[PDB]
Symmetry: D2
């Protein structure tokens, strides 16, 4: 009766919209046992019950449980996906929504979760989702102490997914066959690489020359990509996007758990790439069973480097501020 093949276990630290949605993907695909942890009592248990019922409906078998302590939620977790935190600053108008405004509200939460991971599952792969993304990934890395290849932040796959959908619609092709990437920080300074867009590897410039799309059209698509998060915040009225953020985070977790080696841009540790040190920023990377196995350095032209450098300069400033204000404990 000795267990030989144990199911993978993914812990959702934060069981709000994105956390619950990721639990749903795990149950739908029989990807792994799921634990839902939140500081709000009762709600995780209700969602865990609902998700457990999904397994019967779609004929899968994984365990979905709510846990109220960090130890019970984190022990044995192959992967930890962190969404705990605020989405909007209370009282501010949707018109002024800014992810950076979340910094003083979420930095302590993320640091605390990191300290618990260090204790309960130091060998886990951490995927941070909480905003402001790139700053939070660095806080998590420092607090959790895991090797730099075992921590990353989900964002660029989401921004790139938006970018891809818009291009797919313009070209009337499946997004599967649009490769479009956003690098940089997850915010107003993100960089949609219009120059790099390909359709099954064929350069977008050919479609322009051939009259399928225009330069302005692509420029508007890049701008739409940049403001997509806020666009959804304004339409929804309460909360922010969750369906695609969840699918992106789970796609990254699956590349790790199944050692797929997919090339997914995400917030990763920099050790010389693009000339950066001791910081995390959105870049193309390969995700496999050894975590972040490669960080891809793209050749940036004049204007791209300029936009990317802006995003770097900003996040370094925020990272300094966060460090200056970190609680001694």
């Amino acid at each position: 009766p000795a267990l030989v093949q144990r199911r993978k276990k993914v812990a959702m630290i934060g069981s709000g919209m994105i956390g619950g949605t990721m639990g749903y993907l795990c149950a739908l695909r029989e990807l792994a046992d799921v634990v839902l942890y939140d500081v709000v009592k009762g709600m995780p248990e209700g969602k865990a019950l609902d998700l457990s019922h999904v397994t019967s409906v779609v004929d899968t078998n994984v365990s979905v449980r709510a846990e109220y302590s960090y130890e019970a939620a984190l022990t044995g977790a192959d992967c930890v996906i962190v969404t705990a935190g605020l989405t909007k600053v209370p009282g501010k108008p949707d018109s002024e929504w800014s992810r950076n405004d979340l910094l003083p509200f979420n930095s302590k939460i993320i640091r605390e979760i990191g300290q618990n991971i260090k204790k309960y599952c130091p060998k886990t792969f951490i995927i941070v989702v909480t905003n402001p993304l790139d700053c939070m990934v660095k806080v998590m890395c420092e607090a959790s102490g895991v090797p730099t290849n075992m921590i990353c932040g989900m964002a660029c796959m989401l921004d790139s997914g938006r970018f891809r959908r818009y291009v797919a619609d313009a070209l009337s092709v499946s997004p599967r066959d649009v490769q479009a990437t956003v690098i940089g920080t997850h915010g107003d300074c993100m960089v949609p690489l219009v120059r790099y867009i390909t359709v099954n590897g064929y350069p977008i410039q050919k479609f322009i020359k051939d009259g399928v799309v225009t330069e302005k059209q692509l420029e508007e698509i890049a701008e739409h990509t940049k403001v997509s998060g806020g666009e959804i915040v304004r339409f929804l009225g309460q909360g922010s996007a969750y369906y695609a953020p969840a699918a992106s985070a789970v796609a990254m977790a699956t590349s790790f758990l199944n050692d797929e080696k997919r090339v997914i841009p995400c917030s990763v540790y920099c050790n010389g790439e693009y000339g950066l040190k001791d910081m995390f920023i959105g870049l193309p990377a390969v995700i496999g069973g050894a975590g972040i196995e490669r960080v891809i350095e793209l050749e940036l032209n004049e204007e791209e480097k300029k936009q990317f450098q802006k995003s770097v300069d900003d996040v370094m400033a925020l990272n300094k501020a966060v460090a200056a204000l970190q609680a001694p404990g």
Copy 2:
């Protein structure tokens, strides 16, 4: 280039928790193009954008769009799934939650949607979700005018899914291999058929004799099944269940769209079964390309007949109630 193969189209009338979740399943599986319709302005556009983004992330290609008029939402819909309505009575305590109290509020919404379906997509397959379920399916049938095999209500597959998950846990087996059914009205009077539970077709009785599960334990599972909706309502604090309800409605929609002929209990039109006529109640059925293709009239023991009659009394009282309101 003339379009020869058109994607199926599913309209979610109601884009709250369950409507958005069903749209997610369609995008995740490339099942069909999706239209999100709701009375609340803005929110459906937000969810449609989010869902359209999902198609790139998971490499599928379906169109997800918000539409604010019945005409744009309903035209061309192969299947219409209706979740529009309230989940709880405003100002009422969680301990006092009752699907039956939703009648006064959701009755006119359902009737209006059916009138529009009659006008814009009379050939569609209708799946109702809005509570009080069995009552709302009848309202929808009367307002929409569709053939009786082309409308049903999602409820029993969810109730059965709960029943199956609890039994699966007790037996330590995959719920894929637990066949357990709930029939009757989706409410306090639903009827979990303990006697009919099977494990890959093997009678639960032998597992009781073998000591894997006890009779008292099965009775507790049936009771838990009955109050599982209210249990989630209380735990959540706001709203009600949505993940399993959406997966159940989509499973039904898929059996229709792909003519799978799955055996799925749902609220179906009674043509004399159990002596019932002109009403909808949860029964085991087969869903295929022609809609409800079979309705199973299981033999009930004394206790089941008694519970089923209470289920029947519940739905007839609700239908009487709407009648006083129509």
Copy 3:
């Protein structure tokens, strides 16, 4: 960095029709890295290349490789699926095809593979497919020395699958919703349990009473089920069934690898069930991460017991003959 999440590995010992087809299912679903091994050289390498190409076409990433030695094929295998052996006896009419005639040819092959599993992956989960199935599972158990819960033979899921397809067709329902089971040995004495058939747990007797199907039709379906293997052998002309046998063996492996705990009838070790000891025979069982986690004992009626006893007495006779004829070493 160091690999933290390794892909599962399944070794197909025998790369003929069924072995290559199971390799195909693994590649298609990204289930596990695949190793193809065969005594015939050249062929496994051709199929491994073909299968490696499939991964690109269907966007998955697993390694499919041919291995020439037992050591290279078996080392590190989470599950080993054995199809090595003959399907038909040379120069013999299809009208006379019999799985028992293979006994003298396949006993030695199965014994040798088992001795190599013992050497190279004694902790693996073994799924035997090679005919005559129930006899070969016992030879494999003895030779490999693995715990009795870590070995089973694939047959009843296929026989039950045939049974279910015929019933599904008679009732016009999806076979997902037909629970029909065949127990006993994989051959002319198998026992399709007509009395136990259910449609989503509803007794088949209800459908007979309703006028949808008759007892006579059901008995004809049981007979068809029994002769389905020979029916395909005669239609194909060369070889035997492989699409469904492969799908059945991989479903069983998946239930093990993902600890699904599916209830799948298969040839399993009996230590008291149905009154049998020290032998393998087709029975309903639960397959999970600990291997065969439960052997289900059905309450059989007088006639069912008689049909099952015939199958038991028969396989006990073949097993004794095999033991009698075995080389001391």
Copy 4:
């Protein structure tokens, strides 16, 4: 009663290794009802039975049947995939295997099938597989008379798949994220476009500079790609590749049936691309619910043009050869 949603139907004309394998994919994914047709009697019924058994095993519900006549096999087919024909010349040594030699044997089989499609399912989407591919698609177009956007040949997705797998291995990434394309004639003169290789849209050139792979290695990969079909023929001893060929044809059929609009290189009708007219050759195309929806005409450098002209010369000689025969 009346069926509203009918399952898709795909007819495999030719039920050997590739035809049976595509049927397997249909049953495995519940993609469509399947018909297996072949000149060989018995075998198709054997595989149809085997495949029908698969549906139960994997919990799907599609109908798999063998059909004796063209009329029964073709009537109602949404898509027809043709693999009928020989794989190698009887008595010819494996070291002398050439798709071009199959011409005299397969051209008549393909013309006959084409005439039958015109008769029984003129509105179907035709995917030809039979070698020598580009030539056989032309034979099929002429005989079947279908709209130019409703016929294509599967080959370059397979050749590109090979190309992508080798590059994926060299780079240590999933082939999902390698975009590599082979255009031209499916034979020794096919053109793997090394310059157009991308890793999730990132130019392969930077990977060369980063030392992940060398130019010499990419060139050896391009050569391996060209001779992969023969490599497999040699290793197998009998017959040729069938798992990836089947997956490639079904992926094409799926993009058509669900109107996915995937960009898949395949043999398509030329209306002037590269000055090519009245012939089929492998080019990047968009396959959707209206069949071939766009043909992409990439800018080629000097070397690519040289290699593509040899590809063009190859199929033009074959088409001239067929013309002389029938």
